[PDB]
Ligand binder design. Sequence first.
Ligand SMILES: *C(=O)N1C[C@H](NOS(=O)(=O)O)CC[C@H]1C(=O)NC1CCNCC1
Length: 268
Amino acid sequence: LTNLVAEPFAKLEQDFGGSIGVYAMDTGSGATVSYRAEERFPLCSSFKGFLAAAVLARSQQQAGLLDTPIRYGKNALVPWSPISEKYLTTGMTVAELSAAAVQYSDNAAANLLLKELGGPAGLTAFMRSIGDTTFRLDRWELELNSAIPGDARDTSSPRAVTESLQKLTLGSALAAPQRQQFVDWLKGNTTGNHRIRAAVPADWAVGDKTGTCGVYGTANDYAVVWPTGRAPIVLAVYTRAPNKDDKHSEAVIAAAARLALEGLGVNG
Ligand SMILES: *C(=O)N1C[C@H](NOS(=O)(=O)O)CC[C@H]1C(=O)NC1CCNCC1
């Protein structure tokens, strides 16, 4: 059921000047679209969705966790912390940091939550606990964005991202209340309007998390999409390119998402 219908991903990535990795899963039939799906790509900010899921999993064993107020100093505010900078003088709850990390890609929030989990290895351990043997987080913000060609640090594959996203949003990896909270955070993302969402009709529900390393043409998005009248679709689109100064493209991500939906026979 993989690649029943071929799609022109090679032409797309050639025009982009790099590599595109796509995995998409029709959760009803099990049909998939797969292109470079087992190659590694840098996560960039996209690890923050899984980070929030890991916090929610922890909160199943610690009922007070989400409501815990976290204070932080100015030294915690690394570049691109649009929410946590507004609450420097007050603090934010763990839930609020999680929402900020997911929905605004807040870097300070992400580092504060990584500390809660025992750092990159703690997040990696959570991913292992749900059966993901590919994911690895190695570094913190901002160093995890280096996106060096051939460097496996801070990478996963489109396939493993999609498989893990499915487990967390639709499967049983989270308890039902936590699962719905994760979904709701993804649905409220503000940074993805020009990526997978641009390929998804407005009358379908969708949650996503983006990433943009800023070098090596490296950017990404993953999403859970609910077309009306059929089972949900899970998909991941990752990009990279050979040169440090190569630019990312949101349009290429949206175009790859459209090809994936077309390959699954999902009318969009
Ligand atoms: C994540 O990839 N981020 C955080 C933020 N928005 O994330 S996104 O998914 O909407 O793109 C800005 C881009 C990126 C990030 O942390 N960029 C840093 C800029 C400075 N150099 C290190 C990377």
